[PDB]
Write a protein that binds this ligand. Structure first.
Ligand SMILES: Cc1nc(Nc2cnccn2)cc(-c2c(Nc3cc[nH]n3)nc3cccnn23)n1
Length: 819
């Protein structure tokens, strides 16, 4: 009654009913639900109530060199507010909020909260190590803080509670609505690698096809490893339908009995092809019926080290694998060899896997090695099905601080798609970290909710994990999630309703939007809600006056909100775009990679001023986008002076008229040089550089930024046009262009220092977000095998290609958009 009503609340928060049993052939999901109770309760019990409530956002990384240059006399200023009075206090970079509050007690307990945000500066951390402080220093802003009472931890209340050979009988296949022939392929898969394959005889493709054939495999029963899949595929030759079945279940028991599995349709490698889930659509999908009733020389060391040295994508030959295995104990001494070593394992052999587990018992070097995320990511991809192998990776992730978890959270959530079982160390890890920290927990919610909303292949698994999180996140957050979900669902209806009503925005359309938003305001739209892409901000009532439908292809919503926090230092509005038509999952993955690149450059004291805008995918081809204020499209700047032909002088003239002083114009040029170089390198490595200038924007303060990363003859490495080069002062070279080339090289080489990581993140992105030939682009782009000097020239060539191409590519883009 009360418990059943709480389940409906969770179902409304999740967007999927976890109690549903219409689409299962076992109890794995229910076993996982029950299995996650312990790790949930264990973290909820162990977390510090006060620190969990205030969720301080901190880093233990050293402050970069450019930020130390912006602080003089070893002194940082903080303006402390209280009701109607505010005072400035000189604070040393090492001062703890506990010690600073004592200064505002002697010079004439409470807590320091950031003005206009749900962000607190508390706990035993020096203020230099608070993220907000670092953010303020980055943009050159004074830190405004308020002295108020700490939030009550009671608000985070949690509600109480055998030598036989393997064989499979193929009975037949049937489709309600389809003179070609058809056959069934049966594979024993372990980590993408096919252990054994058997086919059936081709029969005429009809509404029902029956075989009643025993398919005897070469691999024995005992030789079957845990996490092995029975891949069943239907070829007409082209593949049409696929479905999977774990041969050994979540209880270590061999699979037996009759199975009627509804299969998936086909639109090379894809994460969706690994799924243990069956198609929920019974009425329309193809289904299959089955029956189960059962020390080393100098030369070799040099060869071994060459194998270990190679990139993650370089494939191992039989020779390479046999060498790695034979010398596994020397291979075990190199953490970088681990992925390649565990790919040399014959997993279809009981005695070998046993030796592999005996090998993992001697993890002295691995355990003691400094954490390499790139390496750790490798062991979590589709190439590895073994629980123990994968577990040693998740162990390495344990030492990541909350700051670093946020950097890899999205990819780590997507990495769950590669897990053979619903319950896994990785899932438990994501559960643990999300429950420990409110910020990780906030983004965990949305990332998991995103896939539930649009992935039939993985919604069931992710729903079990989200229910797990929500059952321990506390009433306070549960309330915050409820206000958020209601808002986006309301505004998605408005987004789709307006799009229905040529690319010209008429009078009658703009009126209808204002009408609907006025009707929602007075109705059931909550007074305030957290911004999904920025949980620090609380948005309030809609500023309908400033709301509009933009003159675009997909006709998105331009929505603006008042800040719910009265302590806000400015009367700025929170701007959000709601859009249907772009695949914002792809945008999410690119932007997250962009934020990883910003962290990579920070290690080498660089700030290339990227603007990776906030973006949350909320469903199928729909979601929200942060509005970057005071920004315009490069094409629109060309339109205002020219019309439809391009002039180099336009961009520099635009920056001048948007500048009040020369002092701020010089800052606008320097910001452009850095930000252009930033996107030039990033887009080239990712293979998303060749772009029309409609999808490239700039702010009034000079900051260039790319948008709309969905779905990506003369070609170009990146967009460096004569109007960009005119801002630098070149038509020839300039002190700004010399600075530009100096930044590009230093940035490109800095990324190349993390080659493996970027390759894995890329590889994973294509498998979870969007062939082998598509992945191999990044190897060439990062010039794997070449030295720094040789690589420095390579990118300097790419820059010279853009100057030799000029407007040609952009001109061709312009013609392409006119049919
Ligand atoms: C990050 C960002 N900032 C924006 N800010 C501004 C600010 N002023 C005027 C116009 N746009 C707009 C957009 C944006 C985006 N962003 C994205 C990102 C992904 N898809 N679309 N799409 C459109 C379409 C029409 C107009 N704007 N717009 N994106």
């Amino acid at each position: 009654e009360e418990s059943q009503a709480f389940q409906r609340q969770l179902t409304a928060l999740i967007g999927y009913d976890v109690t549903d049993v219409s689409n299962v052939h076992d109890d794995e999901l229910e076993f996982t639900r029950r299995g996650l109770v312990t790790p949930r309760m264990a973290e909820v019990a162990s977390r510090d109530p006060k620190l969990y409530a205030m969720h301080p956002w901190v880093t233990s990384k050293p402050l970069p060199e450019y930020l130390w240059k912006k602080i003089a006399n070893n002194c940082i200023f903080i303006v402390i507010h209280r009701s109607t009075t505010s005072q400035t206090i000189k604070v040393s970079p090492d001062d703890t909020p506990g010690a600073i509050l004592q200064s505002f007690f002697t010079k004439m307990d409470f807590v320091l909260r950031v003005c206009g945000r749900d962000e607190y500066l508390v706990g035993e951390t020096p203020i230099k190590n608070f993220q907000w402080v670092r953010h303020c220093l980055k943009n050159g802003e004074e830190i405004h803080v308020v002295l108020d009472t700490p939030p009550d931890p009671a608000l985070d209340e949690v509600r109480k509670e055998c030598d036989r050979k393997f064989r499979v009988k193929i009975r037949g296949i049937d489709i309600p609505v389809l003179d070609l022939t058809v056959f069934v392929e049966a594979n024993i898969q372990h980590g993408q690698q096919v252990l054994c394959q058997r086919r059936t005889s081709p029969k005429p493709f009809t509404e029902e096809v029956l075989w009643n054939v025993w398919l005897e495999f070469s691999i024995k029963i005992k030789d079957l490893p845990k996490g092995a899949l029975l891949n069943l595929q239907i070829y007409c030759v082209q593949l049409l339908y696929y479905v999977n079945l774990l041969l050994i279940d979540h209880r270590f028991l061999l699979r037996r009995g009759e199975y009627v599995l509804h299969m998936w349709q086909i639109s090379s490698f894809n994460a969706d092809k690994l799924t243990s889930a069956t198609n929920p659509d019974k009425e329309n999908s193809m289904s299959i019926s089955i029956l189960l009733d059962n020390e080393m020389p100098n030369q070799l060391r040099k060869q071994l080290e060459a194998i270990i040295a190679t990139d993650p994508l370089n494939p191992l030959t039989a020779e390479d694998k046999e060498l790695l295995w034979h010398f596994r104990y020397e291979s075990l001494k190199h953490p970088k060899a681990y992925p390649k070593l565990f790919s040399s394992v014959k997993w279809g052999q009981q005695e070998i896997v046993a030796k592999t587990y005996q090998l993992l018992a001697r993890r002295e070097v691995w355990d003691q090695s400094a954490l390499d995320v790139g390496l750790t990511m490798q062991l979590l991809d589709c190439n590895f099905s073994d629980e123990n192998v994968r577990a040693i990776a998740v162990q390495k992730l344990e030492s990541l601080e909350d700051d670093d978890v946020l950097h890899y959270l999205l990819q780590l959530v997507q990495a769950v798609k590669f897990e053979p079982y619903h319950d896994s160390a990785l899932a438990r890890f994501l559960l643990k970290r999300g429950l420990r920290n409110k910020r990780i927990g906030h983004f965990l919610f949305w990332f998991l909710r995103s896939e539930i909303a649009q992935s039939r292949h993985y919604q069931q698994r992710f729903a079990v994990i989200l229910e797990a999180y929500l059952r321990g996140c506390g009433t306070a957050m549960l309330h915050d999630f409820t206000q958020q979900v209601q808002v986006i669902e309301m505004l998605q209806k408005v987004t789709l309703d307006i799009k229905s009503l040529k690319y010209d925005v008429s009078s009658q359309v703009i009126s209808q939007l204002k009408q609907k938003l006025e009707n929602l305001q007075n109705s059931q739209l909550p007074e305030s809600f957290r911004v999904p892409y920025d949980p620090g901000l609380k948005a309030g009532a809609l500023a309908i006056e400033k709301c509009k439908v933009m003159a675009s292809k997909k006709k998105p919503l331009w929505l603006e909100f008042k800040c719910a926090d009265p302590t806000a230092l400015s009367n700025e509005t929170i701007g959000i775009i709601f859009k249907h038509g772009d695949d914002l999952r792809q945008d999410m993955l690119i932007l997250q990679i962009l934020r990883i690149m910003e962290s990579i450059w920070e290690t080498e004291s660089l700030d290339l001023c990227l603007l990776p805008y906030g973006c949350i995918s909320t469903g199928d081809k729909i979601g929200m986008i942060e509005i970057v204020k005071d920004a315009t499209t490069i094409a629109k700047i060309q339109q205002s002076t020219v019309g439809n032909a391009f002039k180099d002088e336009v961009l520099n003239h635009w920056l001048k008229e948007k500048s009040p002083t020369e002092e701020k114009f010089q800052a606008a040029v320097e910001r452009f040089v850095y930000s252009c170089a930033g996107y030039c390198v990033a887009t080239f490595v990712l293979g998303i550089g060749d772009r029309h200038n409609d999808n490239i924007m700039i702010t009034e303060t000079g900051n260039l930024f790319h948008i709309d990363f969905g779905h990506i003859k003369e070609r170009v490495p990146f967009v460096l046009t004569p109007d960009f080069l005119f801002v630098m002062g070149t038509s020839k070279t300039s002190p700004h262009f010399q600075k530009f080339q100096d930044i590009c090289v230093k940035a490109y080489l800095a990324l190349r220092h993390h080659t493996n990581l970027l390759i894995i993140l890329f590889s994973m992105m294509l498998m979870t977000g969007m062939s082998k030939e598509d992945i191999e682009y990044i190897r060439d782009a990062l010039t794997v095998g070449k030295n720094e000097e040789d690589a420095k020239k390579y990118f300097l060539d790419q820059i010279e290609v853009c100057r030799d191409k000029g407007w040609t590519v952009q001109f061709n883009w312009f013609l392409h958009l006119v049919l």
